[PDB]
Each structure stands twice: as structure tokens, then as C-alpha cells.
Amino acid sequence: KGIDYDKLIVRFGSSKIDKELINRIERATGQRPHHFLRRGIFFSHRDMNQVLDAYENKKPFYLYTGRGPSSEAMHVGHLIPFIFTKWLQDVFNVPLVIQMTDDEKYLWKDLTLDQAYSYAVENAKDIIACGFDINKTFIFSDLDYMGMSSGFYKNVVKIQKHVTFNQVKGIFGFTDSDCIGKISFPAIQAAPSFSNSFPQIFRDRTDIQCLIPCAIDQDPYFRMTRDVAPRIGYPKPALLHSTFFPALQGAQTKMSASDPNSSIFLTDTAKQIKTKVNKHAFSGGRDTIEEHRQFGGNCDVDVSFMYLTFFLEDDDKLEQIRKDYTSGAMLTGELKKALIEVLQPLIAEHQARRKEVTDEIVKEFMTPRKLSFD
């Protein structure tokens, strides 16, 4: 029952997203708001109006997200952010910068420097699969970009001294036993938030607003970055907070990346997707059919219904489902089939595109070059 997201906004001191804001965004774009905005999926921001101010006056801004490279599969939750960011991008016709923290993984996990980089490239393919207009998005490897940016490291250093060790010990719990690469990394994570880190596309000029869509329990991490922003004469990056995408087995967790099952993977096949949802997707319906008819299912805790909230685009069909499962008219198996019919095409479509992404294609995304926007 510890789901409260409004009591969450309060303690972090961020701002709730209201109708005002969504309409302002829809007017600014001439488009219909994303369902993530309609349903309270992405409910908080930090300076989103500032971002809109800029856009309305024809003053550009850019978006920045990252991914911690890995070997395991890569699931559906990993898409919430990438999906919202693809919308925002297309909707505003704006530049997207994507950080592949191979160095972080190399520092934290047990990889070979050449390994972590490997993942950064492969994981890049999964990210391209989501569409992302090539003439608008730049995907970089920390390990690769550092040594080919006349502005990235410069910004790391500026951030590196304005952040004490104590500041990170109380935010990532670093210990005297941790390597020096770890203690100093939070700066690498922060740097892309400032426009001149990418001269190849903005040239000098630090007047460009950055927008970072991310999870809400990731806010106390961008505090640091936002605090040391004007302290170094740079604009604070705008945030857009999203809720937690639950793990099949329950909503108590957000679970893993291992524990096979527990997460629909982008590599799972139609059969596999079907199995995981029917067998593991936690059910909020009753145990017997008669008890389910009498009392109905509980939509709040049902994982299969939650997933629908994310991937079912029709607002009306979702409300029908919500209503009938609650009354008992619809049974969890029916809910499951609904979800399965939305996930199979989605995941399979991803598989299709991920096949169309060559090497001469990734090379181009990773090649720092010029782009298109306002």
C-alpha cells in the first residue's frame, strides 16, 4: 500500500503536473498530449514551463537520457523513458543526447574496459529500434566521447570541484573502500546536462535548456547537478518525473534484470510473452470465478492492468477494462489476453526494427555531428 506519489512530490519539493501545463504543452505542440501525461504516469517536473517559454519564443532546448550498458536482456520498463523521450522529441522537433555510461559499468560491475564498451554499442541498437530520428538524436559512449569533445571534460572538471566527497557520500553512499573512479563519476553523469558539453551540435553557447525525463526516485540525484548549475554559470536542467513500472511478480518490487520471468524482455518471443503474463503477472482478481463476479478485481494492485496503463493507447478501451474488471464482468484471464495482445506486437515490432539497424547505422548515431531543430 506504499504507492503514494503525491506524498512523494511533497517530500522532494518538486512540482505536480496539472491540466494547465498539459494544455500549454499541447498548444505549444499543436498535438494531443501523450497518454503518460493524460494518465498520471509522468506527474512531476522542475522548470518545464521555462522549457516551454523558450520553445514558444522559438528558442530551442534539448533532451538528455542515459542507459547503463549491460549484457542481460533489456525489458519493457526500460522503455517507459525511451518512449516518452521519443514522443517529446518528435512532438517538439528537438535534439536528443543519449549517454551510454560504459565507464560507470566498468567502474561498478566486473567488466573489462573493452567489454563495457561492447554493451554500450549493442544496447545502442535497442535504443535506435525505438525510432528516434537520426538527424535529431546523438548516442554517445562515455569512453568514446570523452576523448573527442572540446567541451565535455571541461564541464566535468568544472562540476568536479563544486561537488565535495561528502556531497556524494550522502547521496550514493560512497565509502573509503570504493575506487576513485566511482567517487568522481557523478560529474560524468551531470555534464551532459549542459549544452556546451556537445560543441559539435551547439558550438559554444550555454543558453540552451536541457530537459531530462526520468523516474521520481531519481530526483535526489539530479539535485546535485541542479545545485552546481548556476554555481558555474549554467542553466538548471528541466526534469519530468515518472512513476515506477512494476515487476510481474508484484508491485512490492520493481524487481530485476535477472530472475528470469519477472520482466517481459525485448528478446522474449510471442510464446514467452504469453507465458510470463499468464503465469507470473501478479493478479488482483479473486481466487474463484464466483468470488470474482461478486466482488470484482482490484485494479490498483493488478500488474497486468498496470501494464495496460502504460502500453494501451486508447483511453476509452482502458476505462472499459478498468470498469469491468472492478465489477467482475471481466476475468483476470481476459485482462491477461488483452495485455498479451498489446505486448506481442509491441515487442515483436521492436525485434523487427532492431534487425534493420546495421553497423553503418550505429556508427552514424555515435558519430558526433550536426543535427536539426528550432
89 vs 193, which CB is nearer to its own copies? Answer: 193
Q: How far apart are CA 310 and CA 245, in angstroms?
A: 9
CA 367 to chain centre: 23
**100 makes contact with its own copies (CB under 8 A):** no
Q: Which of 1, 4, 57, 176 binds its own copies (CB under 8 A)?
A: 176
**Mode of pairing for the β-strands spanning 15-16 and 61-67:** unpaired
Q: Are 292 and 326 in contact (CB under 8 A)?
A: no
| Shortest reach from residue 140's CB to its own copies, in Å | 13
141-160 residues near its own copies, rule: CB under 8 A: 143-144, 146-154, 157-158, 160
Task: Check residue 3 for interaction with its own copies (CB under 8 A).
Answer: no
Tell me how far apart the alpha carbons of residues 308 and 340 are, in angstroms, rounded to a whole number.
Answer: 10
Is residue 352 at the binding interface for its own copies, with CB under 8 A as the rule? Answer: no
- Shortest CB 124 distance to its own copies, Å: 18
DSSP 219-274: HHHHHHHHHTTGGGT-PPPEEEEE----BTTBSS----SSSSSSS-BTT--HHHHH
Which one of residues 58, 180, 288, 359 is an interface residue with its own copies (CB under 8 A)? Answer: 180
Binding of residue 110 to its own copies (CB under 8 A): no
Nearest 5°: the CA angle 300, 272, 102 is 85
**What are the backbone angles phi and psi of residue 137, rounded to the nearest 5°?**
-115, 140
DSSP 40: T
Q: How far is the CB of 229 from its own copies (least distance, A)?
A: 15
User: Pairing mode, if any, of strands 238-242 and 42-46?
Assistant: antiparallel
Q: Least distance to its own copies from the beta carbon of 196, Å?
A: 12
Amino acid making up residue 206? T
- Using the rule CB under 8 A, which residue among 42, 64, 87, 106 binds its own copies? 106
Interaction between residue 10 and its own copies (CB under 8 A):
no
Q: Which of 3, 181, 218, 356 binds its own copies (CB under 8 A)?
A: 181
- For residue 255, the minimal CB distance to its own copies (Å) is 28
Q: Is 58 exposed, middle or buried (0-12, 13-18, 19+ CB in 10 A)?
A: exposed
- Residue number with CB closer to its own copies (50 or 160): 160
Residue the block writes with cell 493478479: 283
Q: Restricting to residues 184-223, which ones interact with its own copies according to CB under 8 A? A: 184, 186-187
Question: Whose CA is closest to 131, among 344, 339, 346, 311?
Answer: 346
**Cα separation of 296 and 323, whole Å?**
10
Number of shown-chain residues binding its own copies (CB under 8 A):
39
The stretch near its own copies (CB under 8 A) out of 21-29, 100-108, 297-305, 358-366 is: 100-108
Q: Which positions from 111 through 130 interact with its own copies, judged by CB under 8 A?
A: 113
Give me the residues paired with residue 265 across strands. 75
Judged by CB, which is closer to its own copies: 97, or 163? 163
295 binds its own copies (CB under 8 A): no
Nearer to its own copies, 55 or 152 (CB): 152
Does position 164 interact with its own copies (CB under 8 A)? The reply is yes
Point out which residues bind its own copies (CB under 8 A). Answer: 103, 106-107, 113, 143-144, 146-154, 157-158, 160-166, 168-169, 174-184, 186-187
